[PDB]
């Protein structure tokens, strides 16, 4: 294998050389021409109370009105964000939930965690009660993320270093994505749904093709675990949050890092990241209990969302870009605008 | 100002709130325990006396105990250990047959105990330390001296002294003795000890809350 390891080093050098060759200009130099965004002063429009433990995940419905939140009190709550009404309260069989998802159709929600199982719930039952439609088992590590593709397809990343595509109808994992050397902590699904990107504790992010089960590209540059990952609205780029306290913007077509969002007073890790509808903003959650808004093109800290008494564990921007929701370990979700 | 169906939806939301708070009250009065210990530490037999996380629910002298065996999680503890920051106490299992049984497992057990005890998430959380397999240890000590694992041990190779040496060696790994306690025990006596330790933890937390401690 020694000669094969030398060949591997040669290939690493070749890809580095190619990326350097295409690295003609930096994003900051290109963006120097455009004006900064004014101080982004958002304020809390709603506060969603009812969770009695640390909120670990939240997700918006495609209607930009309903959102599901998962907390380790063993509950998924579906909120009417306009009125703050609770639509549903789903009791989980395992209270150690670490991720939740909302079907684009709105018919189902999913969740998972330390149980290593992704459970799908049917919201639109004739009986008038939400019940588990299936339990996707097969992961040997905790479920870190899950995202619906259709009513029948869901992709889940796990702490066993692998992601898997599932056929909810049969319960079998259609595809298994392998290659990460550490726990896969986050997973972002492309706008076209044909690609998804995952970030793992090996401080790398990989681009996968859903249908071919193929790892197309690998992105590195973080010094620590990648806790969060999000696709740029165009789908041609994505941003990663890390424990090393920096967000980084990567481009699929350029195949390298574009820009890094860091500041000296920010020494803690990043729990969640999210873009705005236009992509000009990059909202990120931090362990220091507040969320920082970043000018995605200038890397300037455009604003701050400081309203939480504990770690901001999750973010979310509605599909229409009208509001931002931030869950936190203080057990409150807040809608900002 | 609200519609009829808007008012009905609000009523539904208030019902959900009532159920949520009832469940919260039900959960608040339950004891949560985290069970740890590397390898064949005897936890597989500890769980019997009371595919990922294994939750075990039991009641003893009118306390509801939830015990979380997370030993099957072959993943980075760094990423999910904070989920348990809030458990009443941690149960740590150590096998005293691991003096010379190599992966010398007792050094790995000491490293794991050091990591768990001095974790930033468990500053207040106390530790119940179970020292299992005292029986086999009582014979192995005769045939194999304890110096094999701790060359600096100056005591006699007798059970009564070696056991105390192991206990103090594990308890000295506590770098925050001013805020955290360790309840060591050599393994209904076992569940009785768990009950005693958690009762003490609860009482001391309450006394701190009310200003008496």
């Amino acid at each position: 294998l020694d000669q094969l390891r030398q060949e591997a080093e040669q290939l690493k050098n070749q890809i580095r050389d190619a990326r350097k060759a295409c690295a003609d200009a930096t994003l900051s130099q290109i963006t120097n021409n455009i004006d900064p965004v004014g101080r982004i002063q958002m304020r809390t429009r709603r506060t969603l109370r009812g969770h009695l433990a640390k909120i670990y995940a939240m997700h918006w419905g495609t209607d930009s009105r309903l959102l599901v939140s998962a907390s380790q009190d063993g509950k998924l709550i579906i909120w009417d964000s306009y009125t703050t009404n609770k639509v549903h309260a789903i009791p989980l069989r395992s209270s150690w939930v670490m991720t939740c998802a909302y079907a684009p159709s709105g018919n189902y929600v999913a969740c998972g965690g330390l149980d290593n199982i992704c459970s799908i719930y049917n919201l639109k039952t004739r009986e008038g009660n939400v019940r588990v439609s299936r339990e996707l088992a097969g992961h040997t590590g905790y479920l870190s993320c899950c995202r619906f593709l259709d009513d029948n397809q869901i992709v889940t990343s796990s702490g066993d270093t692998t992601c898997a595509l599932w056929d909810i109808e049969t319960g079998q994992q259609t595809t298994t994505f392998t290659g990460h050397t550490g726990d896969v902590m986050s997973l972002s699904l492309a706008p076209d749904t044909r690609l998804f990107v995952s970030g793992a504790c090996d401080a790398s992010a990989k681009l996968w093709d859903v249908r071919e089960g193929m790892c197309r590209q690998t992105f590195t540059g973080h010094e620590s675990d990648i806790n969060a990952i999000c696709f740029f609205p165009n789908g041609n780029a994505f941003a990663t949050g890390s424990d090393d306290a920096t967000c980084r913007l990567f481009d699929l077509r350029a195949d390298q890092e574009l820009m890094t969002y860091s500041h000296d007073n920010i020494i803690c890790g990043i729990t969640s990241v999210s873009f705005s509808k236009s992509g000009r903003l990059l909202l990120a959650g931090y362990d220091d209990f507040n969320c920082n808004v970043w000018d995605a093109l200038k890397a300037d800290r455009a604003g701050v969302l400081a309203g939480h008494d504990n770690r901001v564990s999750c973010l979310g921007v509605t599909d229409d870009g009208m509001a931002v929701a931030t869950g936190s370990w203080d057990s409150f979700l807040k809608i900002w605008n | 100002t609200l519609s009829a169906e808007d008012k009905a939806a609000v009523e539904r939301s208030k019902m959900i709130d009532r159920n949520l708070r009832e469940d919260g009250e039900k959960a608040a009065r339950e004891v949560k325990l985290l069970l740890l210990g590397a390898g064949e530490s005897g936890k597989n037999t500890i769980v019997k006396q009371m595919t990922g996380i294994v939750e075990t629910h039991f009641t003893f002298k009118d306390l509801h105990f939830k015990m979380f065996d997370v030993g099957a999680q072959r993943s980075e503890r760094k990423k999910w250990i904070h989920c348990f920051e809030g458990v009443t106490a941690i149960i740590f299992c150590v096998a005293l047959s691991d003096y010379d049984l190599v992966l010398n497992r007792m050094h790995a057990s000491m490293k794991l105990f050091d990591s768990i005890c001095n974790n930033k998430w468990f500053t207040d959380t106390s530790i119940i330390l179970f020292l299992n397999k005292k029986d086999l240890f009582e014979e192995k000590i005769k045939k194999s001296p304890l110096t094999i694992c701790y060359p600096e041990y100056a005591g006699s190779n007798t059970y009564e002294e070696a056991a105390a040496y192991i206990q103090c060696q594990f308890e000295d790994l506590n770098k925050r003795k001013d805020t955290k306690e360790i309840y060591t025990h050599f393994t209904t006596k076992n569940v009785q000890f768990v009950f005693d330790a958690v009762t003490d933890v609860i009482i001391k937390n309450n006394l701190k809350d009310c200003g008496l401690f």
Partner: single-chain antibody
Amino acid sequence: VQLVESGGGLVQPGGSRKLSCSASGFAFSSFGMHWVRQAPEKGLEWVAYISSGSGTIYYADTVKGRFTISRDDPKNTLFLQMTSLRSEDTAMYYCVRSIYYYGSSPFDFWGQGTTLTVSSSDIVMTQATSSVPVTPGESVSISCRSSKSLLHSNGNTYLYWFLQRPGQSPQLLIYRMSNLASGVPDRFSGSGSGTAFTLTISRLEAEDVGVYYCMQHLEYPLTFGAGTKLEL
């Protein structure tokens, strides 16, 4: 899902009687329940409502004080205590389930109902066209109007459409004037505006024959239309 009402019969005027309905195949405890009557040769009329959790109860002015509605959630049974029975109370009584949350479908299931015979302001809903000859395969339209505008501040138009085929209980077609109920063919379409609504059937099938009723859900003294008959 099944609702089976029981207790129908013949009562002398001035008497008292108790109707019952046993729920099965759904989470009865989480639904609101309605009683809806129908005189032997007239349209529907809302009687009473009991909310999920029994926190709210409503009655029609014609029965308020004479009737009382109650539910036994552990038994999954809905009741209607009735006293001072008058000749006007002679009607087929239906039990209707309705769950209220964002995006739900109130009035989505109707029981078969019990016949009760007795020995010898509100928003007005208008369905002027009482009957309409029809042939299969042709486009048809049902029209409706209301005194108040059913469009609420929050953007919802609280109009509901029901079809009662001969020898059957009413079936929900449209809720909130545009949403097609589950199990309803896409042929039916709900249109309308403030205070004027219409229901249209494209490529009408033979099974789309019966009385089409309109109902408002804006002010809780719920009112039905006179109904429109479709005949082949």
